[model samples]
Target: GTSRLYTLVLVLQPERVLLGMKKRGFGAGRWNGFGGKVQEGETIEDGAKRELREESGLTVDTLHKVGQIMFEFVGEPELMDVHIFCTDSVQGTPVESDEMRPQWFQLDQIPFTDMWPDDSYWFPLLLQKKKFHGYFRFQGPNTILDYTLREVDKL
Candidate 1:
């Protein structure tokens, strides 16, 4: 079996969080964290910070590793291992790129309908600032055949 490492970073603040609307490719048309594949020679966290900057025009001094999830799609040999991180502060105002359109949403107002279907299952833990781990098996890009999620003291 093969696993592909990806990163997802959320800019969490007191009552709201910053999410990016994917403008094209992959998760286009949905609001989600800003991140992508971890590149060669960079630590996961470093790759995450790089993606945060690239997608949202923001940078942070530190990021808390809040969770990790494994995504399995039927008929695919490789699983996507996504490391999720969060931070309460950042160095620049969010800006849009060809890949994403940065926006802020109140904690209770996230558009789950427009996001990845698996998000509805685990986002509450992220909102609570609780660390977690999860696995999702999808029949295709939009259907979750089965899944498991749990809060953990450590990721």
Candidate 2:
């Protein structure tokens, strides 16, 4: 009965991606794309852009809504609307904002060991420029129970 919202900015450059290290008390030490909650009267695109700018102090020229996820716990289900965007153009070098420390990683060299378990499954698809949607069920931070990936274009 509860829901949450966030966005992911998939900033790409040939063979690497710009990501952020979440800060302490807010899922710290985890590697993730730039994003945050949606605000009132704000479209998903607006929220995505705001979150990207707020977290990394970078501006993106383009964005696209690519996917969504639903998390069903024992008694409550949380919905996570995932927006994946590509930006060949960006302004302002990434900096360590209050919520995260920005960094870039080679596409093949993404540090899966330091990321959420579910990332390994779908992240590659996004990198390969494939549009997909999926559900990842996790027990905690490292345990994955169920996962599925669907091609959006085919559906």
Candidate 3:
């Protein structure tokens, strides 16, 4: 009914990053990071970590704040406020869950074609260790109608 909040997390290593192929629910069949809705009474990072474990069977030892994005669907209401995070400190081997199949990809081989299109826009900023704010409007799956993004000193 109102703005809904969520988290998206990226697990990074020196030469690779982790992604999960969602098996069910929204944006199924796409490779994306691990995260979901931010539950009440939990800090955003807390929820991000929880979802990471639930979906990928792992936990982040450190979470670095990376970006914040407002996602809107045309002809629909309410904003999807997605807080983005990244970390190099992770624990446990990735295991598949009902929701996602986890895998690691080299930075240059990232499956952008199998992800939300706007991901290609702001994700690079995260690798550069830059804070960012972005807004995107979408008309369909993997289709970005329009977007605005910028680097910021702080989110």
- What's each prediction's TM-score? 0.95, 0.87, 0.95
lDDT of 2 by residue, 44-102 (tens): 78888988888888987778655565543333357555565667678999889767888
List the candidate numbers ranked by TM-score, top first: 1, 3, 2
Which model is ahead, 1 or 2, in terms of lDDT? 1
In candidate 3 the C-alpha lDDT for residue 42 amounts to 98
lDDT of 1 by residue, 1-155 (tens): 78999999999899998999998987889999999999999999999999999888898999999899999988788999999999998998999788888889997898999999988988888877888989999987789999999889987
Error of 2 at 42 (Å): 0.8
lDDT of each: 0.91, 0.75, 0.89
- Compared with the true structure, the alpha-carbon lDDT of candidate 3 equals 0.89
Least accurate 10 contiguous residues by lDDT in model 2: 68-77
lDDT of 3 by residue, 1-155 (tens): 46899999999888999999999987899999988899999999899999888888897778889999999987668779999988898889999888888999999999998998888898789778899999998987767888999999977
Clashing pairs in 3: none
Rank order by lDDT, top first? 1, 3, 2
